[PDB]
PDB file of C-alpha atoms in Angstrom:
ATOM      1  CA  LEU A   1      -3.883 -11.131   2.146  1.00 47.32           C
ATOM      2  CA  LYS A   2      -3.461 -10.583  -1.494  1.00 46.83           C
ATOM      3  CA  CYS A   3      -1.579  -7.106  -2.355  1.00 46.10           C
ATOM      4  CA  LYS A   4      -0.426  -5.873  -5.578  1.00 46.73           C
ATOM      5  CA  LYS A   5       2.834  -3.945  -6.417  1.00 46.72           C
ATOM      6  CA  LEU A   6       4.136  -1.637  -8.827  1.00 46.43           C
ATOM      7  CA  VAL A   7       5.084  -3.056 -12.113  1.00 44.47           C
ATOM      8  CA  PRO A   8       6.758  -4.596 -13.277  1.00 40.05           C
ATOM      9  CA  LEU A   9       5.776  -6.136 -10.192  1.00 37.17           C
ATOM     10  CA  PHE A  10       2.579  -8.050 -10.691  1.00 35.12           C
ATOM     11  CA  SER A  11       0.196  -9.177  -7.822  1.00 33.36           C
ATOM     12  CA  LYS A  12       1.470 -11.386  -5.019  1.00 34.84           C
ATOM     13  CA  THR A  13       0.018 -12.547  -1.507  1.00 34.97           C
ATOM     14  CA  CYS A  14       1.694 -10.897   1.442  1.00 37.96           C
ATOM     15  CA  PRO A  15       4.238 -13.407   2.677  1.00 37.33           C
ATOM     16  CA  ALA A  16       4.988 -14.282   6.035  1.00 37.69           C
ATOM     17  CA  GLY A  17       5.470 -11.143   7.846  1.00 34.30           C
ATOM     18  CA  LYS A  18       3.011  -8.918   6.333  1.00 33.26           C
ATOM     19  CA  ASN A  19      -0.641  -9.450   6.517  1.00 34.69           C
ATOM     20  CA  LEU A  20      -1.787  -5.816   5.549  1.00 30.40           C
ATOM     21  CA  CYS A  21      -1.273  -3.520   2.182  1.00 29.67           C
ATOM     22  CA  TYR A  22       0.286  -0.421   2.476  1.00 29.83           C
ATOM     23  CA  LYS A  23       0.021   2.489   0.207  1.00 30.89           C
ATOM     24  CA  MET A  24       1.877   5.729   0.160  1.00 32.36           C
ATOM     25  CA  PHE A  25       0.842   8.940  -1.517  1.00 32.87           C
ATOM     26  CA  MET A  26       0.926  12.719  -1.531  1.00 35.45           C
ATOM     27  CA  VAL A  27      -1.768  14.651   0.180  1.00 35.27           C
ATOM     28  CA  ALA A  28      -2.689  16.285  -2.964  1.00 35.59           C
ATOM     29  CA  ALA A  29      -3.452  13.796  -5.432  1.00 35.82           C
ATOM     30  CA  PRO A  30      -5.892  11.424  -3.868  1.00 32.46           C
ATOM     31  CA  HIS A  31      -5.850   9.281  -7.111  1.00 32.50           C
ATOM     32  CA  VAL A  32      -2.350   8.581  -7.865  1.00 31.90           C
ATOM     33  CA  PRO A  33      -0.174   6.391  -5.662  1.00 32.77           C
ATOM     34  CA  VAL A  34       3.246   6.435  -5.187  1.00 35.33           C
ATOM     35  CA  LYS A  35       4.294   3.220  -3.439  1.00 36.30           C
ATOM     36  CA  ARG A  36       2.500   0.213  -2.968  1.00 37.21           C
ATOM     37  CA  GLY A  37       3.417  -2.933  -1.212  1.00 36.98           C
ATOM     38  CA  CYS A  38       3.078  -5.369   1.765  1.00 37.25           C
ATOM     39  CA  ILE A  39       3.440  -4.324   5.443  1.00 36.97           C
ATOM     40  CA  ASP A  40       3.116  -5.869   9.028  1.00 35.87           C
ATOM     41  CA  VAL A  41       2.202  -3.104  11.031  1.00 36.26           C
ATOM     42  CA  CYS A  42       0.272   0.253   9.811  1.00 36.85           C
ATOM     43  CA  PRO A  43       2.185   3.181  10.441  1.00 37.28           C
ATOM     44  CA  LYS A  44       0.597   6.686  11.425  1.00 35.14           C
ATOM     45  CA  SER A  45       0.081   9.166   8.636  1.00 29.63           C
ATOM     46  CA  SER A  46       1.484  12.777   8.680  1.00 27.79           C
ATOM     47  CA  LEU A  47       0.442  16.294   7.134  1.00 24.88           C
ATOM     48  CA  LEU A  48       2.584  15.740   4.233  1.00 24.29           C
ATOM     49  CA  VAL A  49       2.666  11.895   3.389  1.00 22.44           C
ATOM     50  CA  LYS A  50      -0.101   9.592   3.889  1.00 25.67           C
ATOM     51  CA  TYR A  51      -0.074   5.879   4.624  1.00 26.15           C
ATOM     52  CA  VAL A  52      -3.441   4.087   4.007  1.00 26.76           C
ATOM     53  CA  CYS A  53      -3.409   0.468   4.919  1.00 25.87           C
ATOM     54  CA  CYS A  54      -6.023  -1.983   3.996  1.00 22.82           C
ATOM     55  CA  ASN A  55      -7.058  -5.674   4.970  1.00 19.65           C
ATOM     56  CA  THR A  56      -8.485  -6.659   1.567  1.00 20.46           C
ATOM     57  CA  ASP A  57      -7.193  -8.157  -1.574  1.00 21.96           C
ATOM     58  CA  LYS A  58      -6.427  -5.745  -4.286  1.00 20.86           C
ATOM     59  CA  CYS A  59      -7.074  -3.034  -1.856  1.00 20.92           C
ATOM     60  CA  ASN A  60      -3.706  -1.004  -2.213  1.00 21.64           C
TER      61      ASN A  60
END
Protein backbone atom coordinates (compact mmCIF):
# COMPACT_ATOMS: atom_id res chain seq x y z
CA LEU A 1 0.00 0.00 0.00
CA LYS A 2 2.45 2.60 -1.26
CA CYS A 3 0.73 5.81 -2.27
CA LYS A 4 2.53 8.89 -3.56
CA LYS A 5 1.69 12.48 -2.74
CA LEU A 6 2.14 15.83 -4.45
CA VAL A 7 5.43 17.68 -4.09
CA PRO A 8 7.16 18.63 -2.17
CA LEU A 9 5.67 15.56 -0.54
CA PHE A 10 7.36 12.45 -1.89
CA SER A 11 6.31 8.82 -1.68
CA LYS A 12 4.97 7.28 1.50
CA THR A 13 3.21 4.12 2.62
CA CYS A 14 -0.42 4.64 3.55
CA PRO A 15 -0.26 4.67 7.36
CA ALA A 16 -2.76 2.96 9.63
CA GLY A 17 -6.22 4.10 8.61
CA LYS A 18 -5.71 4.21 4.86
CA ASN A 19 -4.94 1.22 2.68
CA LEU A 20 -6.00 2.65 -0.66
CA CYS A 21 -4.82 5.45 -2.92
CA TYR A 22 -7.12 8.25 -4.01
CA LYS A 23 -6.78 10.53 -7.01
CA MET A 24 -9.23 13.35 -7.64
CA PHE A 25 -9.39 15.12 -10.98
CA MET A 26 -11.67 17.10 -13.25
CA VAL A 27 -13.80 15.21 -15.74
CA ALA A 28 -12.18 17.02 -18.65
CA ALA A 29 -8.44 16.46 -18.46
CA PRO A 30 -7.97 12.73 -17.84
CA HIS A 31 -4.22 13.20 -17.70
CA VAL A 32 -3.35 15.87 -15.17
CA PRO A 33 -4.54 15.06 -11.64
CA VAL A 34 -5.50 17.56 -8.98
CA LYS A 35 -5.00 15.94 -5.60
CA ARG A 36 -3.46 12.61 -4.64
CA GLY A 37 -3.12 11.03 -1.22
CA CYS A 38 -4.24 8.13 0.93
CA ILE A 39 -7.75 7.09 1.89
CA ASP A 40 -9.60 4.46 3.90
CA VAL A 41 -12.85 4.13 1.99
CA CYS A 42 -13.24 4.85 -1.70
CA PRO A 43 -16.03 7.40 -2.15
CA LYS A 44 -18.40 7.63 -5.09
CA SER A 45 -17.69 9.66 -8.20
CA SER A 46 -19.72 12.57 -9.51
CA LEU A 47 -20.53 14.18 -12.84
CA LEU A 48 -18.15 16.99 -11.99
CA VAL A 49 -15.25 15.48 -10.07
CA LYS A 50 -13.98 11.92 -10.34
CA TYR A 51 -12.36 10.04 -7.49
CA VAL A 52 -10.58 6.99 -8.84
CA CYS A 53 -9.04 4.70 -6.25
CA CYS A 54 -6.54 1.89 -6.70
CA ASN A 55 -4.97 -0.80 -4.54
CA THR A 56 -1.56 -0.77 -6.18
CA ASP A 57 1.81 0.84 -5.57
CA LYS A 58 2.45 4.13 -7.34
CA CYS A 59 -1.03 3.85 -8.79
CA ASN A 60 -2.46 7.21 -7.79
